[PDB]
Write a protein that holds these residues in place. Structure first.
Motif, short mmCIF file in Angstrom:
data_model
loop_
_atom_site.label_atom_id
_atom_site.label_comp_id
_atom_site.label_asym_id
_atom_site.label_seq_id
_atom_site.Cartn_x
_atom_site.Cartn_y
_atom_site.Cartn_z
N UNK B 16 47.85 26.89 63.51
CA UNK B 16 46.68 26.04 63.24
C UNK B 16 45.63 26.14 64.36
N UNK B 17 45.19 27.35 64.60
CA UNK B 17 44.37 27.65 65.76
C UNK B 17 42.98 27.04 65.60
N UNK B 18 42.81 25.89 66.24
CA UNK B 18 41.52 25.23 66.38
C UNK B 18 40.54 26.08 67.19
N UNK B 19 39.28 26.07 66.75
CA UNK B 19 38.25 26.89 67.38
C UNK B 19 37.78 26.30 68.70
N UNK B 21 38.97 23.94 70.86
CA UNK B 21 39.83 23.71 72.00
C UNK B 21 40.48 24.98 72.54
N UNK B 22 40.74 24.95 73.84
CA UNK B 22 41.39 26.06 74.54
C UNK B 22 42.88 25.85 74.32
N UNK B 23 43.63 26.94 74.23
CA UNK B 23 45.04 26.85 73.89
C UNK B 23 45.80 27.95 74.62
N UNK B 24 47.05 27.65 74.93
CA UNK B 24 47.97 28.65 75.43
C UNK B 24 48.54 29.54 74.34
N UNK B 25 48.21 29.28 73.08
CA UNK B 25 48.92 29.87 71.96
C UNK B 25 48.27 31.15 71.48
N UNK B 26 47.05 31.45 71.93
CA UNK B 26 46.44 32.72 71.58
C UNK B 26 47.15 33.85 72.28
N UNK B 27 47.56 33.63 73.54
CA UNK B 27 48.21 34.66 74.34
C UNK B 27 49.54 35.12 73.75
N UNK B 28 50.13 34.36 72.83
CA UNK B 28 51.36 34.77 72.18
C UNK B 28 51.14 35.97 71.28
#
Lengths: 50, 50
Positions: B16-19, B21-28
């Protein structure tokens, strides 16, 4: 004189769907412990559509 | 192998990649191609033998 593939006669008169919806509503009321809330939300919205 | 996009899309909808906010989950999603999979597969076994 002819063969036939007949249903149950408890299905033709739709009653099993009541069992089904009761189970589904129970499953909706349960939590998805391992998973977030948004996934649960998506699933239960998809269940409400039908 | 499974296609990269066919699995990554499931992963992406699960996250559920929100545009905004910054997230650690893109790097996965870093380094998910094949030819590294094969690289690891060829490195590990040779190492365990050697």
């Amino acid at each position: 004189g002819v063969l036939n593939q007949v249903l149950n006669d408890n299905i033709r008169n739709g009653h099993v769907v009541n069992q089904l919806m009761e189970a589904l509503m129970q499953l909706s009321r349960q939590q998805f412990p391992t998973m977030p809330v948004d996934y649960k939300r998506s699933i239960q919205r998809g269940i409400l559509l039908l | 192998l499974v296609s990269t996009e066919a699995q990554i899309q499931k992963m992406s909808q699960d996250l559920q990649l929100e545009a905004l906010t910054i997230q650690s989950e893109t790097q996965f999603l870093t380094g998910i191609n094949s030819q590294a999979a094969n690289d690891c597969f060829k490195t590990l076994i040779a190492a365990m033998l050697s």
